[PDB]
Amino acid sequence: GARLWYVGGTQY
Amino acid sequence: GARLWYVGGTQY
Amino acid sequence: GARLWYVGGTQY
Amino acid sequence: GARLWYVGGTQY
Amino acid sequence: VPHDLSHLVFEAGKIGRLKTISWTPVVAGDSFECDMVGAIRLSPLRRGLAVDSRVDIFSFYIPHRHIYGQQWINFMKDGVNASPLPPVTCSSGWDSAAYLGTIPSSTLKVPKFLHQGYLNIYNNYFKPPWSDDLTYANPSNMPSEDYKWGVRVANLKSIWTAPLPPDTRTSENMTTGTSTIDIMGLQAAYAKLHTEQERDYFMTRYRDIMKEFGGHTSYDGDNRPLLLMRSEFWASGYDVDGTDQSSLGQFSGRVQQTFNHKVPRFYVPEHGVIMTLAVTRFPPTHEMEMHYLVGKENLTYTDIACDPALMANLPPREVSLKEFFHSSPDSAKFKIAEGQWYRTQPDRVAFPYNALDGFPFYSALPSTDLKDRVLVNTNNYDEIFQSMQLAHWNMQTKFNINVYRHMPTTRDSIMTS
Amino acid sequence: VPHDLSHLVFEAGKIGRLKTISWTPVVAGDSFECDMVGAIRLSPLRRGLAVDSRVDIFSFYIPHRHIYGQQWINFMKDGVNASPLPPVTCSSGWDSAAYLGTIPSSTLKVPKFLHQGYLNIYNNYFKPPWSDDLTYANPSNMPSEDYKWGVRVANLKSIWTAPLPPDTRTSENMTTGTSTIDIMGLQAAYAKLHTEQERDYFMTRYRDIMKEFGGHTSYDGDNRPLLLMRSEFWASGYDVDGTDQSSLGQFSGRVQQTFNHKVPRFYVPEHGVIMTLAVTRFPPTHEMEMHYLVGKENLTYTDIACDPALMANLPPREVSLKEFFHSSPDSAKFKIAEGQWYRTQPDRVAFPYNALDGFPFYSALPSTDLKDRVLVNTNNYDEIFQSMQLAHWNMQTKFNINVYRHMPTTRDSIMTS
């Protein structure tokens, strides 16, 4: 579904 | 575009 | 014809 | 592409 | 003309560490394409296969200018009599540049663009985003295992493995008057916090705070290595049945995975290196993770009802490794989004397992510390393999590269003529 | 939504100096388009029209990052509580920012991106290419007339007005042995000189030495203002016939030129300024230039025959302002390409003229110095006009701009709500 994890950008 | 100037009505 | 002036690049 | 190795002929 | 720069690669590394497997110096104006095809193997594990590991192969382009800055610019300008480009220094070990997929020259020194190039690729795409940059000067400055097998990459997103940014505000004060508040000031207060919150959660990167403006930033605006191609896959294999008197009913999982990666032709704007790195990881399955609601004792209306109005309107919740792990200290905290426990589900491993070596799971308890307990804890996989002098995983690939240039030629260079 | 940022422009400046006529601060992600339409007038000249002047209007995009570098990056990241961006300082004169087409704030200070922005646009597209950068810190550091009317642009290519780069080698030694030369070393000697010669003549710019590699460099690689649009035209008008007892048979040339410039819609990647500058110039017609072959006394086979083999194979020829101008010192030199006198022809002005004010020609002798005698000598046009408190040329244009954003709105900002 919708986004979940938020680190402050993109983490591979 | 959209309105800008606001005097409190109409000023000729 | 062919180029002539050469300054070392572009001069406006 | 093009040749590379040069020994002075053919080496098997 | 086509320059066949193909070569074989015999690789090996740890589990959650980024490692360079191939690099090809490129010149300004040449087109680069590669077809990397091989097989990925894990060290022999102690029992039969249980869970497939996921593999990520990356190819990036980092122009030299990005690395030497103005020094490079001058070098190109100066031309033939430009001052030589100083390489970087390394540590006393034939396996002291490993992370750079190269053997440190005879003097234990190596290209800075190999080092910084690598540094730049991690600090921009792997390092957690609230995290601090690897400002290592030389490979002789990075931890032994960081430069042996490579720096630790981040665990696959879980609930506890992707906490909210630790610097995340749980409250915000507006200095008010003693017997009055400014109804208009309050409004403003909210506008500022918004801009702050966004930076904290999503735009920790310039290129990011920009994009939300509806603009774009060239990888040249923020000196970021350009991600050319990305392949991801799950490696598998088969079990081997023991058949002697003593090991009849015993198995050993053999993970042989054929993979392929294709970097489409690419136009190299300037001189630089193309780095190709690999990273092997397992889903963050811990043998002692408990469902938040089942680990936190008294269940309030806010925790159990999933009232939209509530979840959609209160501050992030600070929790401890203790509401998620069965023995874990009450003291190791992290911020979670309210109702996060309802958007997810941990994997569950019966206790009968936590006493068994051969299972690619997380035995040990997390790492009190945020960072460390996110970027994967490789070592907790040492017990999953049999014997190993080929690390945790080994790879045998044939890097089929093809570069189209405007090169002299082999005979016209050796032909003084 | 469309933001009408149109405005009128009442301009005026000198002849061969670059001057900012309009600038519009833009935000990341907005689209910018402009339609500049007006008329260009020259001050009233002393006699009838004789030669049309050419006009160049330029619109460039210089992102802020380009100007504040990392300081800007941090500013955007820091957000609301970022340290303010320090403006630049200016000189005591209401006409002390003129070149920036803006009135210096009440404290005689102005945006650095207005200053550096301008600096960057000259040092990258107008300043002669062998020439040194305008490393002015603040407008209070630039010559009075450079910042009043703007820095001097380069004269239109002539034979004497586009000499070979002054640092151009007329010879190259290869240290040889006493009684032997290395046939192979010699070969190499030639390869190096080649690379040198190219840099000298064509690739004095990184972005240039790159392009000849078959690559490309983003205006972000070398921080160069991006040239969005360019209009060029020749301004004309008509003569006015005097009709009183004394000035019947006398005329005054009136130069009224309707022009238009269109900057096609443009996507602003990041926050920055769009500078629009004008430059008015006359062809470099001197009243005393002589044909090289006619000014250099004894004509040798090499000068008169135009032997292909010869011209195509000897070093650049060093000449003096004396083989081209009738009184000029034997001492002021410049390097020309052999046979250059056969690829060209100077304009010719009868002596009857050199005693007449009202003709947009070069009266005075060149300027012993290379630089100065290339970048136009404006002042030698002062005598061509009648009276003038509107400089040499004045302009009246209506800058029809249209920006498409994602703006709040006029009522929703003043509506605490």
Structural domain spans, chain E:
1-417
- Decide: F278 and F56 in contact? Cβ < 8 Å: yes
Q: Cα torsion at F118, F122, F124, F125 (round to 10°)? A: 130
Way the structure was solved:
X-ray
Least Cα distance to F88 among F22, F142, F134 occurs for F142
CB atoms within 10 A of CB F412: 10
Measured between beta carbons, which residues in chain E are less than 8 angstroms from residue A3? Answer: none
CA E208 – CA F76 distance, rounded (Å):
10
CA E121 – CA E113 distance, rounded (Å):
11
F95: Cβ contacts below 8 Å, ≥ 6 apart? F148
- Decide: E291 and E346 in contact? Cβ < 8 Å: yes
Residue whose entry in the numeric block shows the structure tokens 């740890």 = E14
Least Cα distance to E65 among E207, E266, E269 occurs for E269
Least Cα distance to F306 among F337, F274, F272, F352 occurs for F337
Cα E173–Cα E159–Cα E331 angle in degrees, nearest 5: 60
- Decide: F275 and F59 in contact? Cβ < 8 Å: yes
Residue F354: burial class (beta carbons within 10 Å; 0-12, 13-18, 19+):
middle
- Decide: F338 and F308 in contact? Cβ < 8 Å: no
Tell me the shortest Cα–Cα distance from A6 to chain E, in angstroms.
Answer: 6
Cα F104–Cα F110–Cα F112 angle in degrees, nearest 5: 150
CA F354 – CA F228 distance, rounded (Å):
41
Q: Which chain D residue has the Cα nearest residue E4?
A: D1
Tell me the shortest Cα–Cα distance from E5 to chain F, in angstroms.
Answer: 20
Strand pairing report for F238-241 and F251-254: antiparallel
Q: For E1-417, which CATH superfamily applies? A: Microviridae F protein (2.60.169.10)
CA F60 – CA F268 distance, rounded (Å):
11
CA E315 – CA A9 distance, rounded (Å):
20
Task: Please enumerate, as own/partner, the contacts of F249-252 that have beta carbons within 8 Å and a separation of 24 or more.
Answer: F250/F47, F251/F47, F251/F48, F252/F44, F252/F45, F252/F46, F252/F47, F252/F48, F252/F386
* Tokens coding E202: 């999503």
Q: In a mutagenesis test of the D interface, which of E1, E410, E413 is the best target, namely the one with the most D β-carbons within 10 Å?
A: E410
The CA distances from residue F244 to F7, F44, F239, F247, F358, in Å, are: 42, 19, 16, 6, 20
- Decide: F62 and F275 in contact? Cβ < 8 Å: yes
* Tokens coding E167: 């610097």
CA E110 – CA E88 distance, rounded (Å):
5
- Decide: F125 and C10 in contact? Cβ < 8 Å: yes
CA E332 – CA E366 distance, rounded (Å):
10
Q: Cα torsion at E352, E358, E362, E364 (round to 10°)? A: 80
* Tokens coding E8: 């074989």
CA F48 – CA F250 distance, rounded (Å):
8
Element (DSSP H or E) covering residue E62: strand E53-63
- Decide: E264 and E34 in contact? Cβ < 8 Å: no
- Helix, strand or coil for residue F295? helix
- Decide: E162 and A5 in contact? Cβ < 8 Å: yes
The yes-or-no reply on A/E contact (3 CB pairs or more, < 8 Å) is yes
Buried b (16+ CB within 10 A) or exposed e, F44-58: ebbbebeebbebbbb
Q: Residue D3 is nearest to which of E2, E4, E410, comparing CB atoms?
A: E410
Element (DSSP H or E) covering residue E200: helix E183-201
Cα F33–Cα F34–Cα F39 angle in degrees, nearest 5: 165
Question: What is the DSSP secondary structure assignment for residue F225, as one 8-state letter?
Answer: -
- Decide: E295 and E35 in contact? Cβ < 8 Å: no
CA E282 – CA E363 distance, rounded (Å):
13
F232: Cβ contacts below 8 Å, ≥ 6 apart? F54, F55, F56, F57
- Decide: F156 and F234 in contact? Cβ < 8 Å: no
F404: Cβ contacts below 8 Å, ≥ 6 apart? F1, F2, F3, F30, F31
CA F76 – CA E217 distance, rounded (Å):
13
Residue whose entry in the numeric block shows the structure tokens 């068994």 = E356
For residue E22, the cross-strand partners are: E276
Measured between beta carbons, which residues in chain E are less than 8 angstroms from residue D4? Answer: 410
- Decide: E273 and E114 in contact? Cβ < 8 Å: yes
Residue whose entry in the numeric block shows the structure tokens 């062809």 = F283
CA E253 – CA E240 distance, rounded (Å):
6
| Residue F77 to residue E206, Cβ atoms within 8 A | yes
Element (DSSP H or E) covering residue E12: strand E7-13
E249: Cβ contacts below 8 Å, ≥ 6 apart? E242
Question: What is the DSSP secondary structure assignment for residue F6, as one 8-state letter?
Answer: -
For residue E401, the cross-strand partners are: E34
Measured between beta carbons, which residues in chain C are less than 8 angstroms from residue F127? Answer: 11
The CA distances from residue F299 to F219, F287, F289, F321, in Å, are: 49, 24, 18, 18
Q: How much helix, strand and coil, in percent to the nearest 5, is found in chain C? A: 0, 0, 100
CA E255 – CA E358 distance, rounded (Å):
13
Strand segments, DSSP code E, in B1-12 are none
Q: Residue F157 is nearest to which of C5, C8, C9, comparing CB atoms?
A: C5
Residue whose entry in the numeric block shows the structure tokens 């970048």 = F375
* Tokens coding E201: 């959660």
E142 touching F (Cβ < 8 Å): no
Neighbouring chains of F at 3+ CB pairs under 8 Å are B, C, E
Task: Please enumerate, as own/partner, the contacts of F120-123 that have beta carbons within 8 Å and a separation of 24 or more.
Answer: F120/F62, F120/F66, F120/F67, F120/F223, F120/F224, F120/F225, F121/F18, F121/F58, F121/F60, F121/F62, F121/F225, F121/F275, F121/F277, F122/F18, F122/F151
Tell me the shortest Cα–Cα distance from A8 to chain E, in angstroms.
Answer: 4
Q: How much helix, strand and coil, in percent to the nearest 5, is found in chain E? A: 20, 25, 50
Element (DSSP H or E) covering residue F183: helix F183-201
CA E56 – CA E232 distance, rounded (Å):
4
Tell me the shortest Cα–Cα distance from E268 to chain D, in angstroms.
Answer: 20
Q: Cα torsion at F110, F116, F117, F120 (round to 10°)? A: 160
Tell me the shortest Cα–Cα distance from D5 to chain E, in angstroms.
Answer: 8
CA E125 – CA F154 distance, rounded (Å):
47
CA E48 – CA F176 distance, rounded (Å):
75
CA E105 – CA E107 distance, rounded (Å):
5
E417 touching F (Cβ < 8 Å): yes
DSSP E223-275: T--EEEEEEEEEE--EEEE--STTTTT-EEEE-EEEEEEEEEEEE--SSEEEE
Phi-psi region of F66 (alpha: psi -120 to 50; beta: other; left: phi over 0): alpha
- Decide: F155 and F362 in contact? Cβ < 8 Å: no
The CA distances from residue F152 to B11, F16, F17, F58, F134, in Å, are: 48, 5, 4, 15, 12
Least Cα distance to F152 among F360, F390, F371, F321 occurs for F371
Listed resolution, Å: 3.0
* Tokens coding D5: 């190795």
CA F383 – CA F356 distance, rounded (Å):
9
